[PDB]
Write a protein that binds this ligand. Sequence first.
Ligand code: HEM
Length: 137
Amino acid sequence: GFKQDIATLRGDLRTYAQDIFLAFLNKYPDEKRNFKNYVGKSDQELKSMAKFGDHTEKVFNLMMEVADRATDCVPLASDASTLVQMKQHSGLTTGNFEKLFVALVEYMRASGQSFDSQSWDRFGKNLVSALSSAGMK
Ligand code: HEM
């Protein structure tokens, strides 16, 4: 289930975080625009940069903490608020977050692993309405 998936993901965090983020950026190249330093680079060039790994690991770790704190795949309103208000998410809309979750789910379905891909979809949908409720366009 969903709680075991957090343990799995977390077992090899930096590896999953970069694989999932690459799948997001290649599914939706328009989104790369938000990541000016990553433009013009192949997957392997990105994975060779320390700062790519460091940044994905940090995002993913926070995502796993938000997932951990959820109840039945509904995140806490305060976690959503942390997400809306961080400086770093200044120009974003809820559309950027739903694209991310589509790629996550699609990555999970395609991997070998017994992820509970349906719980992750539902989590992403409930995150997106929580983000809206906390002030995001
Ligand atoms: C639940 C999903 C997400 C979480 C937990 C999250 C969290 C974070 C965190 C913790 C950072 C700062 C990392 C650091 O200090 O190096 C960050 C940065 C950033 N995030 Fe997110 N984020 C999420 C989704 C997104 C999405 C969907 C976008 C855009 C599509 C996005 C765009 C950015 C950008 C552009 C930065 C700045 C990176 C930099 O300037 O180095 N984030 N996010």
